[PDB]
Design an enzyme around this catalytic site. Structure first.
Site, short mmCIF file in Angstrom:
data_model
loop_
_atom_site.label_atom_id
_atom_site.label_comp_id
_atom_site.label_asym_id
_atom_site.label_seq_id
_atom_site.Cartn_x
_atom_site.Cartn_y
_atom_site.Cartn_z
N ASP A 135 0.83 -1.19 0.00
CA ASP A 135 0.00 0.00 0.00
C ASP A 135 0.87 1.25 0.00
O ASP A 135 1.71 1.44 0.89
CB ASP A 135 -0.93 0.00 1.22
CG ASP A 135 -1.86 1.19 1.24
OD1 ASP A 135 -2.71 1.30 0.34
OD2 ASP A 135 -1.73 2.02 2.17
N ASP A 166 -15.09 -7.35 -0.66
CA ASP A 166 -14.25 -6.41 -1.39
C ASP A 166 -14.91 -5.95 -2.68
O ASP A 166 -14.73 -4.79 -3.09
CB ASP A 166 -12.89 -7.04 -1.68
CG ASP A 166 -12.10 -7.35 -0.43
OD1 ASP A 166 -12.24 -6.60 0.56
OD2 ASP A 166 -11.35 -8.34 -0.42
N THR A 225 -3.61 7.96 -3.31
CA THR A 225 -2.56 8.94 -3.05
C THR A 225 -1.22 8.53 -3.63
O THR A 225 -0.37 9.40 -3.86
CB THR A 225 -2.42 9.17 -1.54
OG1 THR A 225 -3.71 9.34 -0.95
CG2 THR A 225 -1.58 10.40 -1.26
N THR A 226 -1.01 7.23 -3.87
CA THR A 226 0.24 6.78 -4.48
C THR A 226 0.44 7.38 -5.86
O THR A 226 1.57 7.68 -6.25
CB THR A 226 0.27 5.25 -4.55
OG1 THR A 226 1.51 4.82 -5.13
CG2 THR A 226 -0.89 4.68 -5.38
#
Ligand SMILES: Nc1ncnc2c1ncn2[C@@H]1O[C@H](COP(=O)(O)OP(=O)(O)O)[C@@H](O)[C@H]1O
Ligand SMILES: Nc1ncnc2c1ncn2[C@@H]1O[C@H](COP(=O)(O)OP(=O)(O)O)[C@@H](O)[C@H]1O
Lengths: 472, 481, 507, 520
Positions: free
Chosen positions: D44, D381, D77-78
């Site tokens: 992550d 998920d 945000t990556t």
């Protein structure tokens, strides 16, 4: 000292792993005479690259044997040998002996000689057709002069068809090469007999004299001595004097200037006229025999043509044109590579698909044989099959395509029985195509002598385990 | 790729240490302590436990092995070797210029095939036959001091897990930490050891006025103003007239003044797990405090109460003639070294019974299970369409190291026998033609007792491949917090 | 493999850096000194690389391509050099990223042919457009080359001289045939135009009041004999003691000069020219027999006369005969600035001419010497090819939009490679912005956006710091020569990217 | 100076390389070395930068950049760091080309305006809920990495109806979805295809005594946390009793209190009684006589959802500070039918048509718990994927489709403005190509080919508007080939790419304005 010899032989593979295939790279060769050259033929790299490591000298000497009985497959000797020794480390690090590997490859070398005829897809019809030669010759010219395979496949086809009726006389010496500074490949053509670039220095355009000689009032009697002996064709090695130039034109003696010594000695062995050192002595025994000596203008350039009208004629000379001497040398090798392609096909004709097709088909069978063949030699027979796979990897890397996708797709089509499938020659397409429909066919007799030599060289290296100096 | 290759040599060196520490002919190792001392152990579990390593990829190999020690007390040596050998094939990571995700999918695909291949060579077991279980457990009794009392260790190891197993819930859960509390008692010998069919508390005797021997005990589970509650909390327990007062927390000094007045046993510092076994043994009930006791908090059904000083040490025997989802081992020995040998060796045998009772399926050990697996994946690779077939074959060639070490540790020609070992699995059935660890030559496993459980190998290959996946998923080292 | 190519990327950029500031008419000069200490200063890119003699192997690849661009065109070889280097520069980060070098050769070979299809489709034929006589069109394209110079005020006078020099020649045009003389003194408008061959004629020896300067069909003799009396070639001195022998010795000195002079009259020479000087004693013998004598002719001017009169230059005098004696129609002498000038007009082989400049400074003729070589080639290539494109780096901006928009539809590895071929063509106009002192930021950012708005011939204005339609301004360049350059640069880069390892014989 | 520009770009550029290879769901893990020596492993990107400690001033500017993205979007945000890194790496070459940062900054601000407008000109509103599929394809493609993907159509249809059951706007036409998703249950149904979808909450408990009817049609449901067993004052403080006779009084008196509680509780008429701490055995007898459906020892977290379903008040204790009352007409909800179904080895209590619940329950019936566990994570998920999309009022096709489309428009827009800002907008859009160029490497595909295929189809979208052109072509990593997100269902929200390119262009301007370094 076994691991050091293997690592030293891998250094030689990288100098010819990338120069193999139609998408192969060129190499910046620098001559010992302070000259620059650029090419992709592996035979020329080793002639200038002085291989001093004795372990790899056996592979170079194996390529020298690749000149006899064949004129192709030199990269097979360098790539297939390097892959066998490269994978040989995986067996030795496990604990296998060097002797069991030597006897294991001799078993697989014979096993491949029995599987190779089963993969022969087609054979030359031997109809002496220009479309037959140029259609089959499309494989050997490429990877040596790529992109210009159209004109070259048809030119040499005209020179070989002229010699096949003279059965039992076809050789590379009959098809000589003569290149002239010009525009490019469009002006190149093929002519019969011996053809040189220097035009007639004298005023004679045509003379049917038989004797040919090869080498102020005094010199006028010496040129008459050439005529008194019954010779109206004089061939001077070096420059010719201005007074001797006109004396030959008085008695209608054809003056010819041949600066290159290869042009002089070529006449010694065809018409018989040998080069005398003295200033034109009257020696008739050392003169040659020619049917007609005339001047021809082909490609906007006058050229001296020695046509043997009376004889059957078996001397061919390809007239090449090119603005660059470096580039014309690359065409010189592709011409000699195509002439030697059909020199092997004078024997029993057998053709196999190229482009890594046979190398997976040959490995798919030997691998299945190694699984069912017990004994301590199966580890060497397995890697002998995986060593063939490096040749597809050589073409996949030069084509800019991932080799992993190549071996998977070549194995998948053959798993379903689809034989005659090779590598797709394209950078944007990692898929495959049928080699039979594309016209890519190699020589069966070349692979029989190539796999034989590459295995004997790798065995010759593995048999040695230490290098010790000496003195006589 | 420098970080991809760093985890190879970080684990390849760790596997090199315990590469020769496998099998009954396991080679010893010399560990130089900082004080000049030397430890000459051979168990790979304790060797790498003390060796400090600098790379982080190698430190994860130690955290993985410790979790394996809790599940199964053996086989952890091969867990790191396979994970180290699987990652040792650098031809497919860097030289072939493949992505790590290409190889992770190949190993995960091979994982599902290895699991099915090991179940094809499985065999059922009749747990009712104690003699058929003796051949399985003897794999750990051999080359030990407990070989003189192998039949006693079989009765102690096999019957103990039968008491922990509760087959009415369907899952059939087996827990050694809660329901198989192993304790020692001084005095006696290994022959004098037996399995108590109940609960035993290690509480020493503090006061003399306590019930020494009672055949039908009764168990109860639970200045001026200071002694007000103390006398009342103690007077509510004697309403039932018990014989041993079992308290969870510690008892005060004045509350014990009424426990010794009643001449009843006073027990304290008892876990919550320990009282439930007693409540299920004598049918008692755990009350929150002493003041809200009822009639059900009695010891009807208990075997006996004995706090006799056995071996110069008191031991509270509250056993019964029932198996209330629990057991208690009584190890007897003349010295602590002999007690330390039987205590640890039975834990290796007790965990083997855990794998069989949960799933009575065995596999042919001694290099036979690997070759049975590696032969199945090799033929499947020739028909597997995709680039993953190349690393799929590397697993077939990498799992051959387990029998390679057993023959190399014996000293015989590993190259000659291992190559011929392939032919036995190629032609004949794969369930036989193993490798003798002591002799070194080939022999069938049906005639020998080298059969290992199924749960031991399942957790091995799952954790051996999962370790390589976690290490190849790394591509950079982040420093910071 | 990979690193040997990066060594060749930078080994070729230093060669481009040696001639980076020479692109355009207003480029920078360099100073290359040879081993003898001789000073050579020139802005021509081809002349820089001829004297550098770079011994690096990968550098000589572009040297061989530039020499071929000079042999065929004689101009624009720098544009082949900077472009060949920029194709290696933009692909530099892509080579190290793992992309194969052979894939790049397919991209340049793809984009090169795509440029020829766009150049031939966009070039406009100009033969008699707008109903204008070609003399005016050749004057319009020529005068723009002379503007913004020291002769900007009288450029119309000099603009008319070039159209007269080309039309006087035959269909075969050559820049070397038209010689330019430099003479200090006088104004700019007093520059004369000679249709024939001429020389400075520094002969100031005797021979006055005779030697008529008019001839009908004179036989021009080309000798190399020094007819001086006390010459270093002819002389006679015999040291003896007898007195009567000295009279024969002084007579033998005059006979060596005179016996050789009788051969000049017997051969039929009417206008005798000689490289070495001729003394006042020999000029009188020519004056007595009514013969024209004028020596001190340079050897270079006689080579233009040998091509004009159609004779041959002989060193010896005994070989003088009708075989080497040329002919002409109008041979007359002028008084340009008072100095004497002999010239032969109306020869049978009048392929060359002469052009004498005038001015009050030596440097004003230097800048004029350079501008005339640029105006002649425009007239030479305008009639040769009526299909031409806009100059000033305009054609380079067209391909940047076409090849880029074409690369946006070509999936595969050829996209960023043919797309990088677009940004690589921006080096030509960027240097014209820097080599002229302009701000390349404002120009290329304003120039590239003009093409999307509808621009098709807008380029870099070398005069003013702004954009201008170079086609409307008659700043034209050939369309085929631009194709011959792009094909030369693509072949130049593809040879470098095709190399991956250097092999050297140990010597 | 320029040397400070180069050193600050490599600092922020290397921060992106830490989270470059970890882009996408197939991102690679990385070792996080703390001060002690522990090693936390994850892929992550957000968690990496929260623990990443790199002492450099230019790098800490990227930390505050992530904080607003965590509060604004909370995901992706990556990608904000990689785009910003390429702008500085590209802007660094411009500084070497004699270009000022102000011209580059002035060009980047305009390029961000046209980027948001071009996206808004190619948006798709929240639709295709019923009557059209990117719904089945949306969830079926996400659950391919699990064992549930054997029969994707059978398991993907249950996700469509689950999202519509949790749909309630409640604010001015809000429509969103709650945090509490469909509670997924499992059982041994002898096969994976026996998964039954329940349009109603399901409580995994049993009534105990079989004499009580399993059919309660009364709408009143009694919800209580107070145990009707022996009520203790406190587990830390016990009532002192100085007489065993007094012990029996409080013992028998406590049972007498339940005789009054059992009548007051049933005085409400609620047959569905749920107790958290448990029900006394004597109290269960009275429900068999009256026929009430009582359940003991219900999980409080499960009761919190039932109280939210029928609208009951969670009664903490019956003692309202003066006596003991049952809170009549407060703890009572409204439902239609509560029937305890007979599922395999679990009698689940099904609730249907409450006052307002907006929920459901999935019975992942299978053969063993190994499959039901892997099936539960796939649907839990997969719900968040469709929940994230159909809540955002407007969405856009993501997966390389937004960044590749802007590569041509903003490059063509640069050819219309000029004014010393063409190279800035030219390189601003070229920097956005790194998102698919990075995801291709993580997908084990050729990085140069897949990016060219997207721009090959995205360019034809602008040449002519004909239907032949392939429009809105994303990039799927599961196959390594471009695909149409309209058919595949790879959609992303609108505000993500808007705020992502917004702060990424602003943060690069902040670091570009730093020319020198003053320290103390
Ligand atoms: N068009 C082609 N496609 C695939 N492989 C080729 C092609 N042309 C040549 N090769 C291969 O490259 C290796 C070298 O070819 P060639 O130049 O004909 O022989 P050599 O290098 O020995 O002179 C051979 O093994 C041949 O199979
Ligand atoms: N008697 C035997 N014969 C052959 N192989 C054996 C024998 N006993 C153990 N082995 C092998 O030794 C390996 C390691 O066994 P063990 O010592 O129980 O685990 P670890 O080495 O991890 O402590 C096993 O994989 C097994 O195949």
């Amino acid at each position: 000292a076994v691991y050091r010899n293997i690592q030293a032989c891998k250094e030689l593979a990288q100098t010819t792993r990338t120069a193999y295939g139609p998408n192969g790279m060129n190499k910046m060769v620098i001559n010992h005479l302070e000259k620059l050259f650029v090419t992709n033929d592996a035979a020329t790299i080793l002639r200038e690259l002085e291989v001093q490591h004795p372990a790899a000298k056996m592979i170079v000497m194996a390529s020298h044997m690749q000149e006899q009985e064949v004129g192709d497959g030199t990269n097979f000797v360098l790539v297939f040998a390097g892959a066998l020794l490269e994978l040989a480390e995986e067996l030795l690090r496990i604990g296998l002996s060097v002797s069991e590997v030597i006897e294991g490859y001799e078993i697989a070398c014979r096993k491949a000689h029995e599987i190779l005829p089963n993969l022969v897809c087609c054979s030359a019809k031997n109809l002496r057709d220009i479309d037959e030669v140029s259609s089959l010759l499309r494989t050997s010219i490429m990877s040596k002069q790529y992109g210009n395979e159209v004109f070259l496949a048809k030119l040499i086809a005209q020179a070989c068809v002229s010699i096949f009726p003279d059965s039992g006389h076809f050789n590379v010496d009959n098809i000589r090469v003569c290149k002239i500074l010009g525009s490019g490949i469009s002006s190149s053509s093929v002519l019969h007999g011996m053809v040189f670039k220097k035009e007639t220095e004298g005023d004679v355009t045509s003379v049917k004299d038989a004797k040919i000689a090869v080498y102020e009032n005094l010199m006028d009697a010496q040129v008459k001595a050439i005529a008194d002996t019954g010779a109206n064709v004089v061939v001077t090695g070096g420059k010719v004097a201005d007074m001797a130039l006109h004396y030959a034109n008085k008695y209608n003696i054809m003056l010819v200037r041949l600066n290159s010594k290869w042009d002089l000695r070529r006449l010694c062995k065809t018409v018989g006229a040998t080069a005398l050192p003295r200033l034109t002595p009257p020696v008739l025994e050392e003169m040659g025999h020619c049917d007609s000596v005339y001047l021809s203008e082909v490609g906007d350039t006058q050229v001296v043509v020695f046509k043997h009208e009376k004889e059957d004629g078996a001397i061919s000379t390809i007239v090449l044109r090119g603005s660059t001497d470096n580039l014309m040398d690359d065409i010189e090798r592709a011409v000699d590579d195509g002439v030697n392609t059909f020199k092997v096909l004078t024997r029993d004709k057998r053709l196999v698909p190229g482009g890594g097709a046979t190398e997976i088909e040959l490995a798919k069978q030997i691998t299945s044989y190694g699984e069912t063949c017990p004994g301590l030699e199966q580890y060497a027979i397995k890697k002998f099959a995986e060593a063939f796979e490096a040749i597809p990897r050589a073409l996949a890397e030069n084509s800019g395509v991932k080799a992993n996708e190549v071996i998977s797709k070549l194995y998948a089509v053959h798993q379903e029985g689809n034989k005659n499938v090779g590598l797709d020659i394209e950078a944007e397409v990692p898929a495959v195509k049928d080699m039979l429909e594309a016209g890519i066919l190699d020589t069966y007799l070349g692979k029989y002598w190539a796999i034989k030599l590459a295995t004997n060289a790798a065995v010759t290296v593995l048999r040695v385990d230490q290098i010790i100096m000496a003195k006589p | 790729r420098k970080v991809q290759s760093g985890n190879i040599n970080a684990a390849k060196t760790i596997a090199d240490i315990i590469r020769t520490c496998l099998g009954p002919k396991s080679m010893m190792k010399m560990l130089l302590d900082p004080m000049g001392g030397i430890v000459m152990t051979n168990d790979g579990n304790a060797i790498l436990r003390e060796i400090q390593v600098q790379h982080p990829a190698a430190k994860s190999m130690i955290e993985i092995s410790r979790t394996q020690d809790e599940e199964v007390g053996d086989g952890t040596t091969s867990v790191i070797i396979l994970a180290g050998e699987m990652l040792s094939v650098a031809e497919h990571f860097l030289e072939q210029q493949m992505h790590p995700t290409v190889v992770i999918s190949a190993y995960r695909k091979a994982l599902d095939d290895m699991i099915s291949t090991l179940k094809k060579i499985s065999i059922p077991v009749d747990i009712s036959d104690s003699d058929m279980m003796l051949n399985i457990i003897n794999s750990s009794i051999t080359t030990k001091a407990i070989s003189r009392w192998s039949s006693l260790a079989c009765n102690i190891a096999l019957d103990a897990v039968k008491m922990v197993q509760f087959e009415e819930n369907g899952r059939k859960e087996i827990d050694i930490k809660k329901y198989a509390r192993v304790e020692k008692i001084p005095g006696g010998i290994i022959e004098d050891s037996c399995v108590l069919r109940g609960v035993m508390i290690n509480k020493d005797v503090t006061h003399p006025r306590m019930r020494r021997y009672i055949k039908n005990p009764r168990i109860v589970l639970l200045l001026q103003m200071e002694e007000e509650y103390i006398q009342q909390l103690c007077e509510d327990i004697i309403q039932l007239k018990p014989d041993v007062v079992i308290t969870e927390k510690g008892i005060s000094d004045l509350a014990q003044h009424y426990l010794m007045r009643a001449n009843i046993t006073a027990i304290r510092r008892v876990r919550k797990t320990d009282n439930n076994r007693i409540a299920r043994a004598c049918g008692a009930r755990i009350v929150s405090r002493p003041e809200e006791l009822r009639e059900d908090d009695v010891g009807t059904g208990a075997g006996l109460l004995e706090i006799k000083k056995i071996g110069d040490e008191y031991f509270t025997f509250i056993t019964d003639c029932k198996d209330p989802k629990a057991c208690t081992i009584l190890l007897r020995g003349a010295s602590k070294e002999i007690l330390s040998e039987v205590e640890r060796n039975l834990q290796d045998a007790m965990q083997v019974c855990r794998n069989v009772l949960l799933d009575p399926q065995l596999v042919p050990g001694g290099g036979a299970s690997e070759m049975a697996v590696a032969h199945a994946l090799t033929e499947k690779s020739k028909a597997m369409t995709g680039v993953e077939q190349w690393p799929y074959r590397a697993v077939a060639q990498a799992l051959e190291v387990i029998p390679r070490t057993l023959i190399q540790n014996c000293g015989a020609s590993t190259i000659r026998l291992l190559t011929s070992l392939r032919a036995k699995h190629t032609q004949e059935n794969c369930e036989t033609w193993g490798v003798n660890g002591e002799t070194g030559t080939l022999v069938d496993m049906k005639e020998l007792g080298i059969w290992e459980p199924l749960a031991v190998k399942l957790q091995t290959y799952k954790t051996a491949v999962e370790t390589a996946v976690l290490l190849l998923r790394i591509d950079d080292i982040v420093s910071g917090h | 493999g990979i690193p040997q190519l990066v060594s060749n990327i930078s080994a070729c950029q230093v060669i481009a850096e040696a001639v980076r500031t020479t692109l355009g008419p207003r480029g920078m000069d360099k100073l290359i000194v040879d081993g003898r200490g001789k000073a050579t200063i020139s802005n021509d890119g081809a002349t820089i690389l001829k004297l550098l003699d770079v011994v690096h192997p990968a550098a000589k690849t572009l040297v061989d391509i530039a020499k071929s661009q000079d042999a065929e065109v004689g101009d624009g070889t720098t544009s082949v050099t900077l472009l060949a280097a920029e194709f290696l520069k933009q692909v530099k980060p892509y080579v190290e990223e793992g992309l194969h070098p052979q894939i790049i050769i397919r991209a340049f070979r793809t984009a090169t042919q795509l440029a020829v299809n766009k150049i031939k489709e966009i070039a406009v034929t100009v033969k008699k457009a707008d109903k204008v006589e070609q003399r005016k069109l050749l004057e319009k394209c020529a005068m723009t080359a002379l503007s913004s110079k020291l002769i900007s005020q009288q450029k119309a006078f000099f603009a008319k001289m070039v159209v007269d020099a080309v039309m006087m020649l035959d269909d075969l045009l050559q820049l070397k045939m038209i010689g330019i003389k430099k003479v200090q003194g006088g104004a700019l408008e007093d520059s004369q135009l000679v249709a024939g061959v001429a020389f400075k004629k520094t002969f100031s020896y005797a021979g006055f009041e005779m030697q008529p300067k008019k001839y009908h069909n004179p036989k021009i003799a080309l000798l190399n004999v020094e007819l001086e009396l006390k010459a270093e070639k002819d002389n006679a001195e015999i040291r003896v003691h007898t007195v009567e022998d000295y009279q024969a010795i002084v007579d033998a000195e005059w006979n060596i000069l005179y016996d050789k002079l009788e051969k000049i009259h017997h051969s039929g020479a009417k206008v005798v020219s000689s490289k070495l000087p001729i003394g006042d004693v020999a000029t009188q013998y020519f004056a007595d027999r009514d013969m024209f004598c004028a020596g001190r002719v340079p050897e270079e001017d006689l080579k233009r006369t040998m091509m004009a009169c159609g004779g041959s230059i002989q060193t010896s005098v005994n070989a003088l005969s009708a075989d080497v004696l040329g002919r002409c129609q109008v041979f007359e002498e002028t008084q340009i600035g008072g100095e004497r000038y002999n010239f032969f007009t109306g020869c049978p082989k009048a392929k060359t001419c002469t052009f004498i400049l005038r001015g009050g400074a030596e440097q004003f003729m230097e800048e004029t010497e350079r501008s005339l070589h640029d105006a002649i080639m425009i007239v030479r290539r305008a009639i040769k090819n009526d299909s031409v494109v806009a100059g000033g780096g305009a054609i380079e901006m067209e391909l940047s939009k076409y090849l880029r928009d074409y690369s946006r539809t070509i999936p595969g590895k050829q996209q960023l490679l043919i797309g990088a071929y677009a940004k690589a063509l921006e080096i030509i106009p960027r240097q014209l912005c820097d080599n002229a002192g302009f701000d390349a930021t404002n120009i290329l950012n304003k120039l590239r956006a003009r093409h999307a708005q509808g621009g098709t011939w807008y380029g870099v204005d070398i005069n003013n710091e702004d954009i201008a339609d170079n086609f409307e301004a008659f700043v034209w360049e050939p369309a085929m020569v631009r194709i011959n350059a792009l094909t030369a640069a693509s072949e130049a880069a593809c040879l470098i990217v095709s190399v991956d390892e250097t092999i050297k014989n140990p010597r | 100076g320029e040397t400070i520009r180069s050193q600050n770009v490599m600092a922020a550029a290397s921060i992106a390389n830490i989270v470059k290879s970890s882009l996408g769901p197939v991102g690679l893990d990385k070792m996080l070395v703390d001060d002690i020596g522990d090693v936390t492993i994850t892929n992550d990107g957000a968690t990496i930068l929260k623990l990443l400690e790199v002492e450099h001033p230019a790098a800490k500017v990227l930390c505050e950049l992530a904080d607003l993205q965590d509060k604004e979007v909370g995901d992706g945000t990556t990608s904000v760091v990689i785009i910003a890194a390429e702008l500085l790496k590209n802007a660094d070459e411009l500084v070497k080309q004699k270009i000022h940062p102000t011209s580059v900054i002035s060009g980047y601000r305009l390029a961000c305006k046209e980027a948001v407008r071009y996206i808004n000109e190619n948006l798709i509103v929240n639709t295709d809920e019923l009557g059209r599929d990117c719904l089945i394809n949306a969830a079926k493609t996400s659950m391919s990495s699990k064992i549930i993907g054997i029969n994707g159509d059978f398991f993907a249809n249950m996700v469509v109806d689950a999202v519509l059951a949790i749909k309630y706007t409640d604010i001015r036409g809000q429509p969103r979805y709650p945090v509490n998703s469909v509670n997924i249950l499992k059982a041994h149904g002898r096969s994976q295809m026996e998964s039954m979808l329940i349009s109603g909450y399901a409580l995994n408990c049993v009534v105990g005594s079989q004499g009580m009817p399993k059919r309660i049609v009364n709408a009143k449901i009694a919800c209580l946390d107070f145990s009707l067993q022996k009520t203790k004052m406190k587990l830390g403080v016990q009532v002192v009793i100085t007489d065993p006779e007094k012990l029996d009084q409080i013992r028998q008196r406590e049972s007498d209190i339940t005789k009054e509680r059992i009548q007051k509780i049933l005085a409400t008429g609620a047959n569905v009684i749920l107790t958290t701490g448990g029900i006394d055995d004597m109290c269960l007898k009275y429900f068999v006589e009256a026929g009430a459906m009582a359940v003991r020892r219900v999980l409080k977290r499960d009761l919190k959802r039932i109280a939210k379903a029928s609208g009951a008040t969670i009664l903490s204790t019956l003692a309202n500070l003066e006596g003991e009352e049952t809170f009549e007409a407060a703890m009572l909800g409204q439902a239609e039918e509560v029937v305890q179904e007979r599922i395999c080895d679990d009698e689940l209590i099904l609730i249907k048509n409450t006052k307002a619940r907006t929920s459901a329950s999935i019975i992942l019936r299978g053969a063993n718990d190994f499959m039901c566990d892997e099936m539960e994570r796939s649907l839990h998920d997969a719900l968040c994927v469709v929940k994230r999309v159909l809540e955002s009022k407007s969405v856009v096709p993501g997966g390389g489709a937004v960044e590749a489309a802007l590569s041509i428009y903003l490059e063509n827009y640069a050819t219309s403005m000029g004014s010393r800002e063409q190279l800035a907008i030219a390189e601003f859009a070229r920097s956005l190509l790194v998102i698919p160029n990075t995801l291709a490497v993580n997908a084990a595909q050729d990085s140069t080919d897949l990016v060219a295929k997207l721009r090959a189809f995205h360019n034809e979208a602008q040449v002519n508007p004909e239907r032949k052109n392939l429009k809105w072509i994303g990039l799927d990593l599961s196959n390594g080939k471009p695909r149409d997100n309209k058919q595949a269902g790879v959609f992303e929200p609108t505000i993500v790419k808007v705020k992502s390119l917004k702060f990424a262009t602003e943060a690069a301007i902040t670091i570009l304005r730093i020319d020198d370094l003053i320290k103390l």
